Symmetry: C3
Subunit: 149 residues, 3 copies
């Protein structure tokens, strides 16, 4: 599966230019942030993305945009943070910012830091993922494309 990723700021672009055949692509926490105790926080990941796969014939009564998945990384387990919706389902048509809904199960504030990696993108196929950085997902303004400001 191939991901076209739009970085929503230059700071985020630099992180993905220096990204430090896996079935999961790690996403960065892009800003230092304090998560309140016993709370759910909708953490903005500073990116938009579309996923591309080979077209396949499916029962329903060359390359296509596909739905994809937002998994916790296994290393999330050592923290008190849990993905509220278990596994995120990103539909083929979504053009908004990718967000991780994080439950802080601790009674203390939790500090996430720029460069932390708590979540990853995954294909329904489970195949290796490649990605590229693009300026827009499509022609629409929500896709960051098209004429004008």
């Amino acid at each position: 599966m191939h991901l076209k990723i739009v970085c929503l700021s230059d700071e985020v672009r630099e992180m993905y230019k220096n990204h430090k055949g896996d079935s999961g692509l790690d996403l960065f926490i892009v800003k230092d942030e304090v998560l309140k105790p016993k709370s759910t926080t909708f953490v903005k990941l500073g990116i938009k993305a579309i996923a591309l796969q080979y077209k396949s014939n499916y029962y329903y009564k060359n390359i296509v945009n596909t739905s994809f998945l937002l998994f916790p990384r296994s290393s999330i387990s050592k923290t008190p943070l849990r993905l509220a919706n278990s596994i995120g389902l990103i539909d083929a048509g979504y053009r908004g910012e990718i967000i991780a809904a994080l439950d802080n199960t601790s009674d203390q504030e939790y500090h996430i830091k720029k460069n932390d990696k708590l979540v990853q993108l995954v294909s329904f196929t489970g195949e290796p993922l490649s990605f590229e950085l693009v300026e827009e997902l499509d022609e629409t303004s929500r896709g960051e494309g098209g004429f004008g400001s």
Copy 2:
């Protein structure tokens, strides 16, 4: 993927008659979830999923396939969490679909008929269609 869905009552039938990689399922009756609890919430439907037959590696045309029960992203706005993370409905399962919901709150939580907290999903992530049937077979 195409689903054949048996609604276990006419009240449920009506909801789905008047109903994307995920097919939203309805909460079918008003219910109180106790604080700090897990409740097996009955969704009032039975279902089988149909896909094209595939060659798969295994050591000893349309087929029924296993499918998945996901939380809806909007569940995050509630204190409810799916206890088993993602439900796996085996190809051979004929019973009612249940959502095992944890109430993470220290107070009771009220779910309402017509609430949409969970969704069915194919292993392929392909769009879903459904029809209502009287029997699964």
Copy 3:
């Protein structure tokens, strides 16, 4: 999908000798106390590689494939929850399979040998078969090769 499983002890081997579904249940292999309000990396005493028919995939005969670790539905009646929601095991991973279990209770939780709390699942949702092997490959991490 077909799994080649290395059992890390004879005790575990005996469990899997005496074990069609989309999920292959894995055993808890040792009695263990999970502390209240904790996350415990529970060692499952196995290593495993998954095999599927090769498929063409967009990226810019049988092969090693990635697979998934799901909670079993019966975990729901316990206070135990899978910390990382669903586990992702990358193609060819050679480490011991671990279940990171949150004990959400304020009491210690006793897991028992023979308990079944998690299962392996294919990305295709196809039936799983398995065989017991002594190594995954020639590497020490695969439990194979010379020595020592």
